[PDB]
Structure 1
Amino acid sequence: MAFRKSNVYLSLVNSYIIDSPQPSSINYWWNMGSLLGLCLVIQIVTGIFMAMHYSSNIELAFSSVEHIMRDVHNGYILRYLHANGASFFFMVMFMHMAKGLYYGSYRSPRVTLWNVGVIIFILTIATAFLGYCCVYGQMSHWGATVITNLFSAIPFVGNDIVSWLWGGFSVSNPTIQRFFALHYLVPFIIAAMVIMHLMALHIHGSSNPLGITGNLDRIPMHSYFIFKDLVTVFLFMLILALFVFYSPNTLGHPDNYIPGNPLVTPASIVPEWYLLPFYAILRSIPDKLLGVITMFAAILVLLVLPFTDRSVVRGNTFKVLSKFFFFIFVFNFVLLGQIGACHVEVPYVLMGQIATFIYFAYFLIIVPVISTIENVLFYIGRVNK
């Protein structure tokens, strides 16, 4: 047999990226995983070549970031690639998850793939927050102390946990050194979790945008889907090069370039935009312990989604009502992210409460009802008794 199938490392690389049989009818939404792998490698590479110059004290964090921005050769490129590739990483990840919960790939043969993906989502939210609190600006320090003061709402244990997590009594030098060590460390756990994602996928094969069996006529990975991935990689690189070179600061807040002063509060303590829907879910209900546990339930309520879907057809491709309600849910998520950026004000508190109720009711209430209705409608429209 061939050397790419005989040698042990090359047999793995062959069976994963060369002749892995992919289904014949997958469209451009299935390239988001290759895009996420490329952008993860981009984040890791630019992070290493920035951490060769970043010093993680409390007197040198923001000064070292603006030393990277001004004096090291092509350092503006590295910092804007990191700070914009994180946003593009989370947007392609949101597209990956929305494709996964639209086309019904949480269903019966890949629930462990869906659970490992949810673990990856938690870990990358965590390391993205730690990286945003490495830079030590005005959004950075106060966002850190806001959500750790949130984390201190545990009744018996909370102050002890939060003064173990801070390394002191407020967000200071031990917290920033701790957050730099953890922001380095967690993406090398995400690399192992992505290897686990690929294994849990590869044991069953990818789904198709129809629900029906891909096992009839499949297509090898090498000469076709590598070039589809090449098309979407060059498009993603073009949009990323635009957002890095022509408007770098149009995504981040224009207050993180004020050095972190723990006396003044900037009157708007919103985090970076990918944490804005979960921040709105947090600020929805007025109590604090219930707020953090409903934020954690908003994160890991994607795990009830395999067990709550009662549709006998895989995916929302040949459904109508669930298409409509899925796009209701997506634009509700976008509205929730919009509400998380405004102050707690006059229609915004009620809009946040109603939006988080629609978010929590799409998974628990709306989808088994409309899936049961669609199953019964398909049966009574098909048979004539």
Structure 2
Amino acid sequence: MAFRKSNVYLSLVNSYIIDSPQPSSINYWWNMGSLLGLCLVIQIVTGIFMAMHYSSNIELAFSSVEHIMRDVHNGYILRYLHANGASFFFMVMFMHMAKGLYYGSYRSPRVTLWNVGVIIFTLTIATAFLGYCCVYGQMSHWGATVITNLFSAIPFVGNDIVSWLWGGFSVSNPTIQRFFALHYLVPFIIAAMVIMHLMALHIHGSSNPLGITGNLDRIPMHSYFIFKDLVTVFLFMLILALFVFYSPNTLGHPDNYIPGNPLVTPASIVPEWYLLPFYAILRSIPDKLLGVITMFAAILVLLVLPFTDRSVVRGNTFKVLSKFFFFIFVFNFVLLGQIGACHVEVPYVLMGQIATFIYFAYFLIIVPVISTIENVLFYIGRVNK
């Protein structure tokens, strides 16, 4: 028996990245997984390095960040990488989620896999918002404010949970310093959460575009998918470099270059681009509590998918009505995020509400209704009993 196999530590590395049996037909959407792994590293490495210069103290916070930009060697490269790496993390995460949502990866025995993934989504969004607060720019302060207040919606203990988090009468020093503390901690949890995502992946292996079994034709992970992955890794770095070096601030908000101020919320306040669709869903409900319940629901609704997809076959590759309605969901999602960047004005409010309906109606009505029809359609189209 070979060493890479016999050693206690290399056998793990071996069965995961070298000998791992993969379905020969998996396309490039299967490359998003490793990309996320890379992202987690870029964020973590860049963060720890920047942390050596950061000061969580509210009076020093914003300036320590500028100190990184202006005085630390390659400090700007560190900051722009971390900030943009944060957005790419989401562009990729969304794609990774979409691929699965399309190819029915949330089904069959891979539910636990999907459920772990949903936790990682909730956690990543959290980590991201904790870090956004650390710059303590105008957007920071107000993001810090609004989001913590989301909990003041809880009926009885509400305000108490909120002031507990703040650690004061409002968002002040205690808030920003514990927020950095936590922004450092969660990433390591995400990392742990990832290894579980991997363990859950590893017992059934990846699926494939045909949505059928890949047991008949396997090819090792090494020297195929190790090199195929390399292609996307580079492609990924190439585009991230284009942003970091030639357009570092395009993905950001200008208000964050103005130090946070507790007496003035800027009329230009807008959430980070990756939070918009969710922001939009909340705005579309004129009730305080329902607004937050619906928003959180929009995330939790993804857990429902393995039960509402009644189809007898996996994936959208061979379903005309599903492929259609899938893209209707994708674009709807983009429209949702667009409404979010818009104002609360006449045509947009109603639009936001119609789309919110669609969003939820996708997982609850369309999919089950559509798939049942396709099951029957598939049957009668060839049965002559």
- Under TM normalisation by the shorter chain, which class is it? over 0.9
How far apart are residue 271 of structure 1 and its match?
1.3
How far apart are residue 294 of structure 1 and its match?
1.0
CA distance in 1, matches of 2:41, 2:227: 19
* Contact residue 312 and residue 375 of structure 2 kept, 8 A: yes
Q: Per-residue CA shift, 1:216-271, capped at 9, x if unaligned?
A: 01000010000010000000000000010000000001110000011111113211
Normalising by structure 2, we get a TM-score of 0.99
Give the secondary-structure state (helix, strand or coil) at the position aligned to 1:219.
strand
CA distance in 2, matches of 1:266, 1:137: 11
* Contact residue 150 and residue 288 of structure 1 kept, 8 A: no
CA distance in 1, matches of 2:81, 2:226: 24
**Number of residue pairs aligned between Structure 1 and Structure 2:** 385
Give the secondary-structure state (helix, strand or coil) at the position aligned to 1:13.
helix
Matches within 5 A, 1:60-99: 60-99=60-99
How far apart are residue 354 of structure 1 and its match?
0.8
* Contact residue 55 and residue 64 of structure 2 kept, 8 A: yes
Q: Per-residue CA shift, 1:295-321, capped at 9, x if unaligned?
A: 111111100001111000100011011
Q: Which residue of 2 aligns with 1:211?
A: 211
Q: Which residue of 2 aligns with 1:280?
A: 280
The worse-fitting range, judged by mean Cα deviation, of 221-230 and 263-272 is 263-272
Identity rate, percent: 100
* Contact residue 24 and residue 219 of structure 1 kept, 8 A: yes
How far apart are residue 151 of structure 1 and its match?
2.1
Give the secondary-structure state (helix, strand or coil) at the position aligned to 1:354.
helix
Give the secondary-structure state (helix, strand or coil) at the position aligned to 2:255.
coil
Structure 1 residue ranges (4+ consecutive) displaced by more than 6 angstroms after TM superposition: none
* Contact residue 308 and residue 368 of structure 2 kept, 8 A: yes
Give the secondary-structure state (helix, strand or coil) at the position aligned to 1:332.
helix
* Contact residue 277 and residue 334 of structure 1 kept, 8 A: yes
* Contact residue 148 and residue 162 of structure 1 kept, 8 A: yes
* Contact residue 268 and residue 343 of structure 1 kept, 8 A: no
Q: Which structure 1 segments of 5+ residues have no match?
A: none
Normalising by structure 1, we get a TM-score of 0.99
Q: Per-residue CA shift, 1:86-107, capped at 9, x if unaligned?
A: 0000110000000011001011
Give the secondary-structure state (helix, strand or coil) at the position aligned to 1:278.
helix
CA distance in 1, matches of 2:150, 2:95: 29
CA distance in 2, matches of 1:342, 1:267: 12
CA distance in 1, matches of 2:231, 2:17: 16
CA distance in 1, matches of 2:92, 2:55: 30
Q: Per-residue CA shift, 1:22-51, capped at 9, x if unaligned?
A: 111000000000000011101100000000
Give the secondary-structure state (helix, strand or coil) at the position aligned to 2:99.
helix
* Contact residue 255 and residue 268 of structure 2 kept, 8 A: no
Give the secondary-structure state (helix, strand or coil) at the position aligned to 2:109.
coil
CA RMSD of aligned residues (A): 0.7
How far apart are residue 291 of structure 1 and its match?
1.1
Q: Per-residue CA shift, 1:345-369, capped at 9, x if unaligned?
A: 1111111111111000000010000
Give the secondary-structure state (helix, strand or coil) at the position aligned to 1:310.
coil
CA distance in 2, matches of 1:101, 1:36: 17
Give the secondary-structure state (helix, strand or coil) at the position aligned to 1:22.
strand
Q: Per-residue CA shift, 1:56-90, capped at 9, x if unaligned?
A: 01101100000100011000000000000000001
CA distance in 1, matches of 2:341, 2:151: 20
CA distance in 1, matches of 2:183, 2:351: 34
